[PDB]
Design a protein around this ligand. Sequence first.
Ligand code: HEM
Ligand SMILES: *[C@@H]1O[C@H](CO)[C@@H](O[C@@H]2O[C@H](CO)[C@@H](O[C@@H]3O[C@H](CO)[C@@H](O)[C@H](O)[C@@H]3O)[C@H](O)[C@H]2NC(C)=O)[C@H](O)[C@H]1NC(C)=O
Ligand SMILES: *[C@@H]1O[C@H](CO)[C@@H](O[C@@H]2O[C@H](CO)[C@@H](O[C@H]3O[C@H](CO)[C@@H](O)[C@H](O)[C@@H]3O)[C@H](O)[C@H]2NC(C)=O)[C@H](O)[C@H]1NC(C)=O
Ligand SMILES: *[C@@H]1O[C@H](CO)[C@@H](O[C@@H]2O[C@H](CO)[C@@H](O[C@H]3O[C@H](CO)[C@@H](O)[C@H](O)[C@@H]3O)[C@H](O)[C@H]2NC(C)=O)[C@H](O)[C@H]1NC(C)=O
Ligand SMILES: *[C@@H]1O[C@H](CO)[C@@H](O[C@@H]2O[C@H](CO)[C@@H](O)[C@H](O)[C@H]2NC(C)=O)[C@H](O)[C@H]1NC(C)=O
Ligand SMILES: [C-]#N
Ligand SMILES: [Ca+2]
Length: 595
Amino acid sequence: SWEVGCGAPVPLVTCDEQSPYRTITGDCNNRRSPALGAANRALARWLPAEYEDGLAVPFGWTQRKTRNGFRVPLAREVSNKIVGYLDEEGVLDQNRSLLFMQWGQIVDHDLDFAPETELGSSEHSKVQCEEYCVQGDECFPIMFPKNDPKLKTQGKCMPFFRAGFVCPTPPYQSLARDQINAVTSFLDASLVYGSEPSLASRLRNLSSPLGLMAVNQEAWDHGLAYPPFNNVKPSPCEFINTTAHVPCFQAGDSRASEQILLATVHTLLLREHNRLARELKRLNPHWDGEMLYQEARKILGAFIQIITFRDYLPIVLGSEMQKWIPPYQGYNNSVDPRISNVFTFAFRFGHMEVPSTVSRLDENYQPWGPEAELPLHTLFFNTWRIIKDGGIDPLVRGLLAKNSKLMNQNKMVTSELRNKLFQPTHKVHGFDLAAINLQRCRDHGMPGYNSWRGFCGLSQPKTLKGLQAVLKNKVLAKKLLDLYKTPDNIDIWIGGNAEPMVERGRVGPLLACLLGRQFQQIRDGDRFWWENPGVFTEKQRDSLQKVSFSRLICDNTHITKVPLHAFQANNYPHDFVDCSAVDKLDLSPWASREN
Ligand code: HEM
Ligand SMILES: *[C@@H]1O[C@H](CO)[C@@H](O[C@@H]2O[C@H](CO)[C@@H](O[C@@H]3O[C@H](CO)[C@@H](O)[C@H](O)[C@@H]3O)[C@H](O)[C@H]2NC(C)=O)[C@H](O)[C@H]1NC(C)=O
Ligand SMILES: *[C@@H]1O[C@H](CO)[C@@H](O[C@@H]2O[C@H](CO)[C@@H](O[C@H]3O[C@H](CO)[C@@H](O)[C@H](O)[C@@H]3O)[C@H](O)[C@H]2NC(C)=O)[C@H](O)[C@H]1NC(C)=O
Ligand SMILES: *[C@@H]1O[C@H](CO)[C@@H](O[C@@H]2O[C@H](CO)[C@@H](O[C@H]3O[C@H](CO)[C@@H](O)[C@H](O)[C@@H]3O)[C@H](O)[C@H]2NC(C)=O)[C@H](O)[C@H]1NC(C)=O
Ligand SMILES: *[C@@H]1O[C@H](CO)[C@@H](O[C@@H]2O[C@H](CO)[C@@H](O)[C@H](O)[C@H]2NC(C)=O)[C@H](O)[C@H]1NC(C)=O
Ligand SMILES: [C-]#N
Ligand SMILES: [Ca+2]
C-alpha cells in the first residue's frame, strides 16, 4: 500500500486517557488507533474502488470507455425506466408508521456525511456546471436522456458536484480516491451535539451553568424550545418563502432542515437534552455545567443506541437480524468501527420508503386545518411551516398515525423526490434523488452488484434467467438488463433495492448483509457502547432499558396520547394509550451522594 496516513481538516488533540465521556470528534475511542471512527477521515473500503482509470475517474464519465464491454446507462434514464411511477394509491406500508422512515434518516445522519466539493465562493465553476452542462473537474452533470420531459421545461442537465476526498481537494495524483466522512462513525448522538469542537460549542448555552443546549429566542412552541436559527446568508429556508423570513435550524448536523419531519425529530432530541440536564441538576445540585452537558449527552446517545437496536433494526433486518447481529459479547478493539463507503449507499433504501405527502393532525388525530395534508416537495428546507403554522405537535401526531411508503419494485421512489426535489445550492424544485444516488455510486467508485453479492456470499446472476430468479420478477430483470447489458454493471443502490424483501424485514438479502455487517461493527467497535461494562452502572442500564420513543414524545411535546410501539402501524384510537401508561426513564441511579 501507499501513504498509510494522508491528512486533511483532521483537528486538535490527544486522549484524556481515562475520561468517561466521548470526545466530540470521535477520536480517542479506540486506544491503539485513536483516529479509528473519528470525523472527517476517509470512508473505509470493504472492497477496492472501481474507477474508469482505477484511480478517481467515475464510470460514465468518458462517454466511450465501457464497463466490462458495455456502456453504462445514463443515471437519469435508469430513473425514468426503473425507478419512477405515477399512481400513489396502495403504496403505503400497512405495518410501518411514518416514524420508521423518519428514524432511519436520523440514524443515517448520525453515522455518515460525505460533503460535496465547495471551491465555490465568488466562483463561476458552478456557472459552467448549472448553465452550460460542461463536464469538468468537479462538475459531473446528470444529462437528460432522449425525450425526457425535463428537457422541454428545465434544461439539458441537472448540476451535480463530485464528493470531497482525502489528501487535498485540488484533485488528480498518487492513490485511489477515497471520500471523506465528516461525522463520527459511532452511534453517539453526534447529529445533536456536532462532530467538530467549534460548532459543538456554539450549540451550547454557556451563559448559565446548567449544561443546556442553546435554544431559539425569536420563537417558542407553547413554551417548549426550538433549535436556534442558523444565520448564515443566504438561507435555503428563507428562499422557499421570502415573505415569512424563517431561517433554517442550526443543529449538530448540517442537514437538519432538509425537510419538515427531520427538523421535527431534531427538536424533540434537543428538548430531551435540556430536560435531562435540568433533571440531573435537581438530583445533583453540586454538579457544574460541563458535567451536566456531558452526563446528559451520554444518556441521549445511549437512548439513540437503545431505540435503534431494540426497536429499529429488528424490523428493518427481519429474520436476518440474528445472522448478522448476534447478542452483545462486549467491546472488541480488533473491530473496525469506521463506516464503509458502500454503507452510505446501502442505507439509502430509506429513499424508497418516503411517501408523497405529510399531514398535520389535531388532538383527536383528525386533519388539522384547511391544508392539513401537504405535498412533500413543498417541505424541503421548510421551517416557516413549523414556526409560523402550528408547531411540532401536529407533525408528531402525523408521524405516529400515518404510514411509511412500502418499497415496491413497480413503484420505487415517489415523484416528490424523483422530479420535484429541492437542493440548497440551486433555485428550482426540479432535481432527482434517484439519478443523484446512481451518479454518486459512480462518483464514489462503487463496485457493481454481483461484486457485492459475492462479498456477501450470494449467487451472482449472469443471465436474464438468473437475474429473474434473484429478483423474483421477469419484467424488472428485463428492464434492468436492457439498460446495463450485464448484472456485473448494475449500480449498487438500485441493484440492492430491486431484490425482494426478506421475511419480516424491509430490505433484501444483499442489503441485510451490508447493513447487518456495518451495524454489528459500530456496536462491537465502540468502547462507549451502552452495554459495555463500566460505561454505565448496573442500576443505570437497568433503567435505560426502559426508554422508548413513546415516552420521548410525552415528556417533550403536548401530545398526550401515543402508541406503545411507535414504529409499527397504529390506528387511532384503538392503539393509542394515555402517556401515563408509558414507562418513564427513572433518573435516580444518577443521583450522586457525597460523603
Ligand atoms: C423525504 C426524506 C428525504 C429526503 C428529502 C432526502 C434527501 C437526500 C439528499 C438530497 C441526499 C444527497 C444525495 C447526494 O448528493 O449524494 C441524500 C443522501 C442520503 N440519504 Fe436521504 N433523504 C430523505 C430520507 C432518507 C432516509 C429515510 C434515509 C435512510 C433511512 C436516507 C438515507 C440517505 C443516506 C445514507 C444519504 C448519504 C449520506 C452520506 O453522504 O453519507 N435518506 N438524501
Ligand atoms: C409564505 O408564508 C406565509 C406565512 O408567513 C403564508 O401566508 C399565510 O397564508 C394563509 C392563507 O393563505 C393565512 O391564513 C389565513 O388566515 C387564517 C389563519 O389564522 C385562516 O382562518 C384563513 O382561512 C387563512 O388561511 C396566513 O395567516 C398567512 N400568513 C401571514 C401572516 O401572511 C403564505 O402562504 C406563504 N407563501 C408561499 C409562497 O408559500
Ligand atoms: C407488525 O409488525 C410488528 C412489529 O414486528 C409485529 O409484531 C411482532 O409480533 C411478533 C408475534 O409473533 C413478535 O415476535 C415474537 O413472538 C413470540 C413472542 O410472543 C415468539 O414466539 C417469536 O419467536 C417472536 O420473538 C414480535 O415481538 C413483534 N414485534 C415487535 C417489535 O413488537 C406484528 O406482528 C405486525 N403485524 C402484522 C399484522 O403483521
Ligand atoms: C441559557 O439559559 C438561560 C437560563 O436558563 C436562559 O435564560 C432564561 O430565559 C427565559 C426566556 O428568555 C427567561 O424566562 C422567562 O422570560 C419571560 C419573562 O421575562 C417570559 O415571558 C418567558 O416565558 C420565560 O419564562 C428567564 O429569565 C431566563 N432564566 C435565567 C435564569 O436567566 C436562556 O434563554 C438560555 N440561552 C439560550 C441562548 O438558549
Ligand atoms: C474480536 O473480533 C475479531 C474480528 O472479527 C475476532 O477475531 C477472529 O479470531 C480468529 C481466531 O480466534 C481469527 O481466525 C480470525 O481472523 C478473526 N475473525 C475474523 C474473520 O476477523 C475475535 O473473535 C474477537 N475477539 C474476541 C476476544 O472476542
Ligand atoms: C439524508 N438526507
Ligand atoms: Ca455519530
